[PDB]
Amino acid sequence: TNLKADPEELFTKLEKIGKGSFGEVFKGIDNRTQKVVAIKIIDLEEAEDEIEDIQQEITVLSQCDSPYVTKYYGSYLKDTKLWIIMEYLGGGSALDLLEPGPLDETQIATILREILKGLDYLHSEKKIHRDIKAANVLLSEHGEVKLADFGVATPFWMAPEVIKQSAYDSKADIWSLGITAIELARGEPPHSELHPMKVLFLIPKNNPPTLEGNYSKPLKEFVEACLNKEPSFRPTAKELLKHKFILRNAKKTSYLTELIDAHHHHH
């Protein structure tokens, strides 16, 4: 992190665009390029126990160089405040884009395909995302789909072995992807009506969720593949990129601008 430069001279801070982990997130302008950025400001006086978690996510982001992972531009310390500068993605999150109404299976398949490309990248780099969910999938204004908000190394997207504090690996991300597929299809993850502490024992106790409703059998099978209780029975991200649901239904990401437009016109 840069300790000399004054982030308030380098960036113009604009409106809040999100409640982030450990701090609020603002739309900002890079004053030298006039590009829009996302700025997370964390008060390190008021968030002291979590500082190592913040450092860990910065480290992981700084090691990533993929079209499918939100870019990290650096961080600055001013008085007690840490400014973290990231790529601004103007389409908003996939969770945002569920608000006007249901996605169609081409949109679901396209978003899942792009998430899978990001997971393929991370897993090939021996990284685990750890918090795959629609709120952490961001779209550019062109429809590009990228991962953000890595989990630290709410239970609804957690694999059973993560909850049982077993040794887990990248297959935990594949379970979370299955939950995210249900969320993209239905609007909410399984058990969304229940208190989190009940969900904490239901996920290990119960059979895995299934996708309920009038969805194509390939989509239900995609979900069932990801949501195996046994991690070794879950496919890899590489394998899932060849799943018939993806191959039959995914299309150009640029088509997702229609989804972004529907969210803009809805508001």
Ligand X SMILES: Cc1cccc(-c2ccc(-c3cc4cnc(NCCCN5CCOCC5)nc4n(CCCCN)c3=O)c(Cl)c2)n1
Regarding 118 and contact with ligand X (CB under 6 A), the answer is no
Task: For residue 207, give Cα distances in angstroms to 189, 228, 263.
Answer: 15, 9, 35
Single-letter amino acid code for the residue at 14: L
Q: Which two tokens stand for residue 230?
A: 């046994």
Given the complex with ligand X, which of 38 and 128 has the nearer CB atom?
38
| Annotated catalytic residue within 96, 120, 131, 173 | 131
Count the residues of the shown chain that bind ligand X, applying the rule CB under 6 A: 26
Q: Encoding tokens for residue 13?
A: 């801070």
48: Cβ contacts below 8 Å, ≥ 6 apart: none
Site map 73..102 versus ligand X, x via CB under 6 A: -----------x-x-xxx-xx---------
Nearest to 157 by CA among 189, 135, 205: 189
Q: Which of 57, 114, 120, 183 binds ligand X (CB under 6 A)?
A: 57
When binding is defined by CB under 6 A, the residue of 25, 109, 177, 185 that contacts ligand X is: 25
Residue with tokens 């969910």: 133
Chosen residue from 21, 107, 180, 249 binding ligand X by CB under 6 A: 21
Helix, strand, coil percentages, rounded to 5, for the chain: 40, 20, 40
CA atoms within 13 A on the CB side of 217: 0
Is 151 marked as a binding-site residue?
no
How far is the C-alpha of 222 from the C-alpha of 235, rounded, in Å? 10
Query: Please, which of residues 126-185 interact with ligand X by CB under 6 A?
Result: 135-136, 138, 148-149
Q: Is 143 annotated as a binding residue?
A: no
Is 89 known as a binding-site position? Answer: yes
131 has catalytic annotation: yes
* Residue 123: count of CB within 10 angstroms of its CB: 19
- Distance, in Å, from the CA atom of 176 to the CA atom of 209, rounded to the nearest integer, reads 12
- Does residue 21 have a known ligand-binding role? yes
Q: Taking CB under 6 A as the rule, does residue 40 contact ligand X?
A: yes
Q: Does residue 47 belong to the site contacting ligand X (CB under 6 A)?
A: no
Residue 121 counted as an annotated binding residue: no
- Tell me the C-alpha distance between 240 and 233, whole Å: 13
Which chain residues interact with ligand X by CB under 6 A? 17-18, 20-22, 25, 38-40, 54, 57-58, 61, 70, 84, 86, 88-90, 92-93, 135-136, 138, 148-149
Residue ranges of the binding site for ATP? 17-25, 40, 87-89
Residue ranges of the binding site? 17-25, 40, 87-89, 136, 149
Q: Annotated active-site positions, please?
A: 131
